[PDB]
């Protein structure tokens, strides 16, 4: 599924995500916009030969499992295919497992890089929540 940019704020407040561990919606959106586009089927290989997959990108080498990233974890305890759903539920209940993890949002390459500092207000601007 692609997600509009406000559905998804919606979405994601709806599953608690709103000042989670601190961070507000606006990050999670800007995060979700930069890793996948707002689409749950993304999935990008990596060097390492892990795989990240849908609208946070979640990796494979600590998260999921896909049968297929030798010596990996799989900390959410669910297939790597569930965080490709239409429905986010999966993949925002393993972010919110990432983001306690120590190094908060800075987990995602692309919000550091995109998002971290920015007016992420803006991207939940005009929608009704
Ligand atoms: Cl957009
Ligand atoms: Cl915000
Ligand atoms: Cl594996
Ligand atoms: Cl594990
Ligand atoms: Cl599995
Ligand atoms: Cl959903
Ligand atoms: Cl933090
Ligand atoms: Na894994």
């Known amino acids: ?17 709103d000042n989670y561990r601190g961070y507000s919606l606006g990050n999670w959106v800007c995060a979700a916009k930069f890793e996948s586009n707002f689409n749950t089927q993304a999935t990008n290989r990596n060097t390492d030969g892990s795989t990240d997959y849908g609208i946070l990108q979640i ?7 896909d049968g297929r990233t030798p010596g990996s974890r799989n900390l ?3 297939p790597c295919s569930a965080l490709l759903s239409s429905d986010i539920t999966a993949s925002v209940n393993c972010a919110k497992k990432i983001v306690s993890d120590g190094n908060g949002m800075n987990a995602w390459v692309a919000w550091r890089n995109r ?7 803006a ?5 009704r929540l």
Not at 59 to 65: A, E, K, L, V
């Open 1 to 17: 599924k692609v997600f509009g940019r406000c559905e998804l704020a919606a979405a994601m407040k709806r599953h608690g995500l």
């Open 59 to 65: 990796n494979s080498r600590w998260w999921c499992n």
């Open 76 to 78: 959410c305890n669910i």
């Open 115 to 121: 998002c971290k500092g920015t007016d992420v207000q």
């Open 123 to 127: 991207w939940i601007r005009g929608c």
